[PDB]
């Protein structure tokens, strides 16, 4: 049940892919690669980076995986350009799916709700001030199209039930995404604009932003 999968292309090689910057307030934890393009590596802030001897990637104690930026050595710039283009195609694939199953459901207030598989569209801000549950099997899919901001309140969690898995959940969000302190987020975020995770928050999925990503003492695990 649910919509056809969203193709990520080579954007599916990253835990975090951004265009304008990736910042951390240490200590954050990222499991998976971090890519940044077309911004230069100066816009990776807070990672205390060490360049590979190759000059094509860098490492941080905060990241399990490689970091890459647009001014690193060949072929990193070209690999990232392809990834950024794939992210752009993924955003448009998800954002332009037609015929939502659910339109303006709950006027965007998701706390306490149970969300079965489907294509959802909101033309408003969306948020949750309480936990909410995404329920379906391990093969079901969800696409959440959000024209406004997306917010998850402090301490609140997106709970997967039934077998639902993070790689089959896509949030395609035009406005800024805020994940408050101690919150737990699930799914792939295709963000047109910025994304922030606050202290002690976590995300299982990916953060694919066309602007900047801020990680304040936060955890991101690729799914
Ligand atoms: Na090396
Ligand atoms: Na709510």
UniProtKB/Swiss-Prot annotation:
Origin organism is: Typhula ishikariensis
Which gene codes for it?
Answer: K1-A
Q: Name where it's found.
A: Secreted
Q: Does the keyword Signal apply?
A: yes
User: Which InterPro entries is this protein grouped with?
Assistant: Ice-bd_prot (IPR021884)
Protein name (database record): Ice-binding protein K1-A
| Phenotypic consequence of residue 147 to D | Has 63% thermal hysteresis (TH) activity of that of the wild-type
Pfam family of this protein, just one? Ice_binding
Q: Where is this site: Ice-binding?
A: 20, 212
Q: Which UniProt keywords apply?
A: Antifreeze protein, Secreted, Signal, Stress response
Described function: Binds to the surface of ice crystals. Inhibits growth of the ice crystals. Has antifreeze activity for survival under snow cover. Has high thermal hysteresis (TH) activity, which is the ability to lower the freezing point of an aqueous solution below its melting point, and thus the freezing of the cell fluid can be prevented protecting the organism from ice damage. The TH activity of this protein is 2.0 degrees Celsius at 0.11 mM.
Q: How does activity depend on pH?
A: Optimum pH is 5.8.
Instruction: Tell what triggers its expression.
Output: By low temperatures, 0 degrees Celsius.
**Assigned protein family:** Belongs to the ice-binding protein family.
Transmembrane ranges? none
- Judging by the UniProt lineage, the source's domain of life is Eukaryota
Q: Name one GO cellular component term.
A: extracellular region
Q: What is its main location?
A: secreted
């Amino acid at each position: 049940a649910g919509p056809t999968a969203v193709p990520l292309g080579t954007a599916g090689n990253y835990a975090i892919l951004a265009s304008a910057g990736v910042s951390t307030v240490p200590q954050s934890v990222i499991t998976g690669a971090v890519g940044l393009s077309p911004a230069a590596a100066t816009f990776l802030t807070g990672f205390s980076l060490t360049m590979s001897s190759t000059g094509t990637f860098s490492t941080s104690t905060q990241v399990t995986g490689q970091l890459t930026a647009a001014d690193y050595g060949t072929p990193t710039p070209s690999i990232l350009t392809t990834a950024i283009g794939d992210m752009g195609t993924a955003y448009v694939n998800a954002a332009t799916r037609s015929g939502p199953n659910f339109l303006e459901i709950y006027t965007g207030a998701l706390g306490g709700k149970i969300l079965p598989p489907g294509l959802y569209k909101w033309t408003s801000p969306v948020g949750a001030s309480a936990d909410f549950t995404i329920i379906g099997t391990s093969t079901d899919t969800w696409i959440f199209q959000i024209a406004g901001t997306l917010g998850l309140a402090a301490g609140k969690k997106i709970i997967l039930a039934g077998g639902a898995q993070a790689k089959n959940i896509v949030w395609v969000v035009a406005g800024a995404v805020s994940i408050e302190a101690g919150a737990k987020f699930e799914g792939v975020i295709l963000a047109k604009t910025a994304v922030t995770l606050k202290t002690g928050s976590s995300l299982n999925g990916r953060i694919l932003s066309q602007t900047a990503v801020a990680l304040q003492k936060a955890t991101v695990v690729q799914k």
